[PDB]
Symmetry: D3
Subunit: 303 residues, 6 copies
């Protein structure tokens, strides 16, 4: 029958049916929003990202038939579990709400998609994956975000992965791609290298993308964490702290596609999108497509 235009209808991710995190449902893919941005240290706005991403996803409703007539995500079911009910302030309670909602959504779908929210949400999100043996994380990011303490707190967006690792012994490895900038936390760098994490600077992606893909995990359980600031600001300006010369959409997608075809993807988060910082709206439109395209890749290699 007739379908809504992007500007029509209630905005749910992939225009999927709306459900409750603890409701009686099941789907191949389930979206969950985390409108939390009080942990970032510069420009707020990421709390509006979940809503912006849902709206932008109406431009990319599955399934998809490419120029080659091949159709992806054909038959794959989606669901939108709404957003985590967050309190004001109270970061600890917020973290607990996030982990609980994440647990519920995880048990009702195959591949859960978390929409941030600043990067600090990745920590409580990952806590819902403690039972995943030898959990690996493929992180697209301009920064390492493995810092211990910053501005007198352990919960800033610069510390999510540091917090996750000390709370999840099953999180055995992180591969970070896209790092750049004038400042790096030496303590954080040393801590990541001490745990054997893989650090891939944007310089290496530019110099030899093939070699970078050859460094990605294989036959592993992988959780994808995409910080939109990993992408070049020209491409995705909507983010609090942009760094020049980043990933093109194509490069970021190639890394995600490669990792999705050789691993068991257990989930993915999309964080640091700041809609208010991009009045052209391309940031959310492109990141919404990124998620959908990644899912296409994920389900094109399910065993």
């Amino acid at each position: 029958g007739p379908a809504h235009l992007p500007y029509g209808g209630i905005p749910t991710f992939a225009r999927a049916p709306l459900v409750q995190p603890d409701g009686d449902w099941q789907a191949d893919v389930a979206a969950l929003g985390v409108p939390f941005d009080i942990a970032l240290g510069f420009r707020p706005g990421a709390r509006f990202a979940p809503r912006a991403l849902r709206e932008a996803s109406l431009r990319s409703v599955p399934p998809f038939t490419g120029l080659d007539g091949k159709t992806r995500l054909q038959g794959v079911t989606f669901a939108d579990a709404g957003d985590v009910i967050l309190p004001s302030l109270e970061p600890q309670l917020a973290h607990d709400r996030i982990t609980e909602a994440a647990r519920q959504v995880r048990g009702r779908c195959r591949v859960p998609v978390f929409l941030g929210g600043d990067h600090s949400v990745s920590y409580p999100l990952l806590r819902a994956f403690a039972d995943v043996p030898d959990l690996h994380v493929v992180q697209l990011d301009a920064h390492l975000d493995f810092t211990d303490t910053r501005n007198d707190t352990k919960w800033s967006n610069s510390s999510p992965f540091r917090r996750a690792c000390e709370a999840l012994p099953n999180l055995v490895h992180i591969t970070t791609v896209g790092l750049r900038g004038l400042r790096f936390d030496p303590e954080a760098v040393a801590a990541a290298r001490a745990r054997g994490h893989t650090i891939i600077p944007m310089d290496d992606v530019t110099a030899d993308l093939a070699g970078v893909l050859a460094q990605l995990p294989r036959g592993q359980n992988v959780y994808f964490s995409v910080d939109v600031d990993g992408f070049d600001p020209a491409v995705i300006p909507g983010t609090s702290s942009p760094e020049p010369d980043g990933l093109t959409y194509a490069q970021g997608m190639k890394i995600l596609a490669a990792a999705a075809a050789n691993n068991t993807v257990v989930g993915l988060d999309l964080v640091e999108l700041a809609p208010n910082l991009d009045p052209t709206g391309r940031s959310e439109l492109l990141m919404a497509r990124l998620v959908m395209e990644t899912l296409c890749e994920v389900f094109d290699h399910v065993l």
Copy 2:
């Protein structure tokens, strides 16, 4: 339990449960969006109004306890039937789907709320009230919008009530308040007076508000049509063609309040809001509140 903050959760009007127009449900108040703006003659954007109003309504979730301790809308149930599935172009087809959806929603609730969309939507919207005896329309508008033909079309936003009157013999009277501007369609004015419609220029409201309220219907079946451009552009700048020296929120609400308490309100539409034209977002916030406050007035004097 805990409640979402305005930036959290899926945006449904008044944060009410989502439903289908011809679905199996019933409620006191039901919202229906009509993201149609190709009929206006200047600045587009109203197609995004339904979505903006839903989001802004999260700042005004019922019920409401005033400073006097009194609570309003207690026990009143709300529902959101989404938006009419409109085609691209094809105005005649759009009109038919609008009316059908309006009919379906009106038969499932007591007071239906229609979110435009340019003012031309009022026509196919009123066609769903053909069975209301001696139907009266109280319209807040900077313009009369009773034009026959404009720019070689009969379906522009300048002709909704002219179209509605020729298609509905039961629509017996219209009271338009807030009229102003340098240009008036003489043929439209003549046709309106010929039918005995009441025309109340903004000057009348300014000179004597009490006299204006005395001209409102009493004990009649009333359909409310609120064109946001009836309000002063300083108050509501988010609209295609603003006209200086309009209604303050308070004046417009006083009119709606008086009419609501003295009549049987059969419905209401809120049109011409253009979110894209007000980056401060106050336009949607105030108009979302206007709809809720009007509803407070309506259900506060139910017989």
Copy 3:
């Protein structure tokens, strides 16, 4: 035949035919733009005002038939003489070009309309009225703009009327209405008072508009200078240096209408509009209408 919508066609003031300042033409009203804003002391943008005003005037193309069915500006011819060709910097050269173009335009129309541009343009514009006996200026403005020197220059926008008076012995009186703000140049205020100029603070307008209209000139040759910041910033926010609690559109219009009904209007300038500072676009829309409505009043009482 069919007429363009506001967004269609080449933007000329009031959609009037385009002409050259010294060309072979004659019209009742002729517009001339002065896209000069390098003399203001705060936020630039007024250089774009002439263009924005033309675009906005397409929403106010004459003639106008009001609610009473009466028509104004019927048969009144319009022309757009384009813009003065300004150099970069070189204020004195710019001034000479503005005066020359204004003189040429004045000699080919009854009422010239000058679109600024920061307020400093009023000086060279006025030099073109050296032959007007006992020239009076009715100035709507939040600021006096009668300063001798400011920031080491004689040509800032804070000095146009001071420069005008010293260059035109025939400019015998100025009536300034709308003044407000924490700071005033004591020398400028005292000099204006000592010259017999009339200073009407906004507080007087609020306290007794009737008393203010009674202070306006009668039977004089009047030049209207409208600085948009004379209007309340809530109404017209698009201006460099806004001051709270100003004229509503209605008050400013009543003042101009009163003066137009009892005097011989020789010209009008509209200055300090900064379109870039009002993304809602209501500033240029309302100010273009003010010019058109003022002309309606002018030609309704011309002798």
Copy 4:
């Protein structure tokens, strides 16, 4: 010597010299910024308010010679103590630092000026006045902000005065002006009325301003708290949660001027300004002027 233009120089409040809160200085007036906005429940941005207000204050540098030729704030010294060094998250720590910095600034000046920041900062700010006998607070606000708990926290901006009262037995009375809206916390309203607070709805100001001025404290130790949302959104749209029909700049200023003429002003805060929500920039220009004008009134009646 030449003076800077508004867009020139380093932006310190009123172009005052920069000092450390606990440094070796003394001045009549001292500004202290609190760029904290993680406690608000809707739209962020107030963290940028202290900076925006400083920049805007460059348009209002003291002293001021008015239209009447009289000068105010002549010889009155100013100091800018910078901003409280805030951590990320960690509300309690932020609170303690805010109180400590405020105490130190207070002991070094006659009248401290605090620039927020969301309204939650008023709580830690007021703790620095625990020694003031019979401390009265005059609050301009659209909301009461006397809530005990909201969204699972005691520190939201909706609870500053509630926290202040239960922590300051010397805070004997609060006069709140401008209240309006559909939703009010019944528990908060009751608790406030019970403690003997004076609640003055905006409707009261509209109906009789003279009466409202008579309800203000007299001969008391007064702390001013100005929430920019107390002003009408058409005038000051840059704020998280606007409410229609608020104070005009003039009405708000009349209230402050009245209170400043009959009491001993011990301090003032300006909170909830969101520059990012007003691209016209009028919100910060007008609120910076409000602070300066209030200081003019305070020093005109120094006992």
Copy 5:
């Protein structure tokens, strides 16, 4: 002697004299605007493109002397035929208005430049070339736009070339370059391949541009259709539905240049520009330049 700066003068394309489509004039190049955008399915704004392009063209007024000292477009005359007078709605009438105006302009110049407008305008525009033998079209676009039916209409901006081909058997071939995205209409793709149209995905331009150029027509009558969304969103963000990883300005220009060097160019349209979606203004500045540079290429290879 002196010339206007970009912000000065009436904005006509290339600052060319204004003429009527059916007036008595002749010029090498003539521009015609089609401010129509009610056919697109997402974000409106293209109706303002013709005006934005005209304004932006003031930064690219011919002739042009390059770094090598060689001048292009020397002696090439220009004219601006204004905009097609469009009705409100009534797509079929608009289509006829467009075709007739386009033919009139075509009979008075050598190369016509059409300024859109959503991509649907290409259909009625092409009907004006029904008298051209073996008409070839070189289409820069992110989408094929060869769809038959979409959202219950035949006239959406997704069907222009489909409508053109079935109405113009003389349009023997189309070469589309820049195709990309997750969704492709299998029906449209088939109909295109069937007619033998050449489809060149953006991946092919990236893989080997020289190969793509070798696929362009030679010695044919060619019409250029440039959809701005064919360019990368980072470069041209001002467009309704952006797609990542597109043409750089240089790539698009290389394609246009190659085709203009060995073909008879009969016209060109520039569509889907949405100035309202790019507040930096680079979208219109770059596309106006693209048109002018394309003309430089065309007149550098005339037989």
Copy 6:
């Protein structure tokens, strides 16, 4: 002691202490702003660049430890000398004040950093380097800016280097990189080559960046002039007159890094940034970083 987050504290360049140009101080690096933009010929805004650059520099406070573990800018002291006090208009007086302030700053630091301001400030800035033997200028720019007269003035931003060369016989050579665009001043190109100046078009950079670095000066006294428009508009859209296909941040930096490693850097200016033209704020963030990264290269290799 704790450190301010980017949105906290008074915005001075690199959070450096404030000083007066002719005060008693010394520092390795000193910043001086020149908020002058009345000489540009298109879109103003550059007057706001010094303040935006200072605000943005708070995200790049020295020293910097890279991913490789090396730390740069260690032991490098900074000072912010504020802004040159500019008059209104009076370009000659402005020039004199700029030169004088630059002289004072240069005599108190090792590497002065000048924040513009339109490009015309480079002329009076360079006059402060008259005692530098065989002075060389490495200019990143989309335009040559070696024009004699433009729009009836010798002081436009298109003439800074022409004016500098005729005033400074010691300015023996200029290397300009990034030139592009359809129009070039033939008289300026000829005069530049006549003097042996090296012109390096963007095409050369794209074709062989290694070769361009090879063409940079070696062992000379070099003054860096960075016009942000030398960069691609997709990367840095905030500038008056953008030209497509410009330098990536990386390319521009590589050029500066190379020159800084093989020459004595006497100073650097950063001009034409227009914060108001880039609402995403990435323009000032990337350019402030550029200045800081250039400084780290300078001190990491100085003789």
